[PDB]
């Protein structure tokens, strides 16, 4: 199913589990990556991926981007590299699909998505001044798998 | 539900509270001589008989209480609104 | 609405702010108003009886007499004049 179907915020917030059943499980395997035992303050560089437009990102997209990003960080820094990345959003919005014409059209539950306002940080990484470019590459690969354009913003990092 | 056979309440005849006995209203027999009875015979003939060709309606899932309240001292009874009760059993 | 009883859609207007929760002070339930007085109508969630139809919450009527302990307040619903039977517990002097 095309994201064009759900990327916009054109419907009420639909998140109440107490009144919604059959909600598919999320495809996001991890929200905290890298060395999650170490603090974020223990790093000289902090870079986030910022969304430029308000949108809805389905869990299948969060997983693909996160995966295609952490994967790179793993390939370039190792299965234990001194870094840590965080996917700070969770897919709370439940999505339907009307899958009989327009009669009794309320759709059946088909998935979940996270609402992201423009300007917000979807992902945030913490690395050493060495791997600062490997993370910028991980994000480049991440924003290629989500709807909106993104800014790779470098927070703590005056080593340029 | 349950209900007391006798209890104190207002008797609209004595105009004061007194013991009463509650009884379910028993149907009295018809005489077959009321005006409606004669109209059924005057207006029924050959073919359909209008209202006299209709047959008994249905039933409500629950009926309302149909009771008589007799004053224990003057012997007169009075009626009251009834309330839907699936079952009415008197105590004693 | 899905139903049309008297308390339809009254979740907010008939609910107490948590701190006003609990039996209300007797003073305002015994207050006396004179004919001609302007009184605001507002049901007190904690007081069961002596209420008017929730739809009239927020009206500022005129006491034009009483019935028993309750008051008869005159209001103008839209363009229709109506008389409301309401106890002091749900009334407040204006100004």
């Amino acid at each position: 199913k095309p994201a064009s179907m759900y990327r916009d915020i054109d419907k009420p917030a639909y998140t109440r589990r107490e009144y919604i059943t059959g909600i598919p499980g999320s495809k996001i395997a991890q929200h905290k990556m890298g060395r999650k035992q170490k603090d974020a303050d223990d790093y000289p560089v902090q870079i986030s991926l910022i969304v430029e437009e308000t949108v809805q990102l389905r869990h299948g997209s969060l997983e693909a981007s996160r995966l295609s990003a952490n994967r790179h960080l793993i390939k370039e820094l190792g299965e234990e590299g001194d870094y840590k990345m965080t996917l700070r959003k969770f897919p709370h919005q439940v999505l339907r699909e009307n899958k009989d014409g327009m009669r009794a059209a309320f759709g059946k539950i088909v998935g979940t998505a996270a609402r992201v306002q423009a300007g917000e940080q979807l992902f945030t990484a913490y690395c050493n001044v060495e791997d600062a470019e490997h993370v910028k590459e991980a994000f480049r690969r991440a924003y290629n798998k989500i709807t909106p354009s993104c800014r790779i913003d470098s927070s703590p990092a005056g080593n340029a | 539900m349950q209900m007391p056979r006798r209890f104190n309440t207002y008797c609209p005849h004595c105009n004061e509270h007194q013991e009463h006995e509650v009884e379910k209203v028993r149907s009295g027999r018809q005489t077959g001589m009321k005006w409606i009875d004669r109209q059924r015979e005057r207006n029924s003939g050959i073919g359909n008989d209008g209202k006299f060709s209709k047959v008994p309606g249905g039933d409500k899932p629950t009926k309302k209480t149909d009771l008589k309240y007799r004053c224990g001292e003057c012997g007169k009874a009075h009626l009251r609104e009834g309330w839907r009760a699936g079952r009415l059993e008197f105590q004693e | 609405p899905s139903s049309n009883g008297p308390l339809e859609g009254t979740r907010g207007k008939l609910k107490n702010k948590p701190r006003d929760r609990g039996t209300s002070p007797p003073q305002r339930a015994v207050e006396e108003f004179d004919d001609g007085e302007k009184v605001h109508l507002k049901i007190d969630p904690s007081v069961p009886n002596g209420r008017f139809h929730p739809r009239f919450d927020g009206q500022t009527g005129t006491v034009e007499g009483k019935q028993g302990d309750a008051y008869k307040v005159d209001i103008v619903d839209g363009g229709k004049e109506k008389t409301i039977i309401v106890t002091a517990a749900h009334l407040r002097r204006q100004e």
Partner: protein, 186 residues
């Protein structure tokens, strides 16, 4: 106390001094209240009326100012309570009060108690108060008889500061006699 949503009772409720439910029922009469209180040593009667910023006492009497008319006996007994009610009642009539409702606050409606004695006294003073005779102690007890006979079972004077040996209900009579009289400075 715990947080924002926490509900603290009305002050007089947490102090455990005012039964608001009874209060409301009392105020519904539209009449003044004959507020009967009592301490370990004393008894107080007040005729309270409703007011804009709080109640308003129009008249009242304390067991202390009872002596002011010839009383050398204790002030926490039946004779004491009755006379106090009568004194408060009399003053009530003075200020123009003609009827009331007994407000025993948080005391118990025990038959023949002092709050009921205060009531009988206030009623004899001419005040119109809804009551029930078979809940009022019998005349003699009000006088102080019960305590006289108690002193009868002597061995050691009932009272410490010798007010008298075999005590006195007859004194109660002298004082009641002095109050029912016209003269008296209320």
């Amino acid at each position: 106390a715990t947080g924002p949503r926490y509900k603290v009772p009305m002050r007089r409720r947490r102090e455990a001094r005012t039964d608001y439910h009874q209060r409301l029922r009392l105020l519904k009469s539209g009449k003044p209240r004959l507020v009967a209180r009592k301490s370990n040593k004393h008894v107080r009667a007040q005729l309270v009326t409703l007011g804009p910023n709080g109640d308003d006492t129009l008249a009242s009497a304390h067991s202390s100012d009872l002596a002011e008319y010839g009383w050398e006996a204790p002030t926490g007994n039946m004779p004491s309570a009755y006379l106090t009610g009568l004194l408060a009642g009399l003053r009530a009539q003075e200020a123009g009060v003609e009827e009331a409702v007994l407000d025993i606050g948080l005391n118990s409606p025990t038959p023949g108690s002092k709050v009921f004695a205060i009531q009988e006294g206030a009623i004899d003073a001419g005040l119109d108060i809804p009551h029930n005779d078979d809940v009022l102690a019998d005349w003699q007890r009000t006088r102080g008889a019960h305590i006289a006979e108690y002193d009868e079972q002597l061995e050691e004077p009932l009272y410490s500061g010798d007010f008298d040996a075999a005590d006195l209900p007859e004194h109660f009579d002298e004082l009641r006699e002095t109050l029912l009289d016209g003269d008296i400075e209320l």
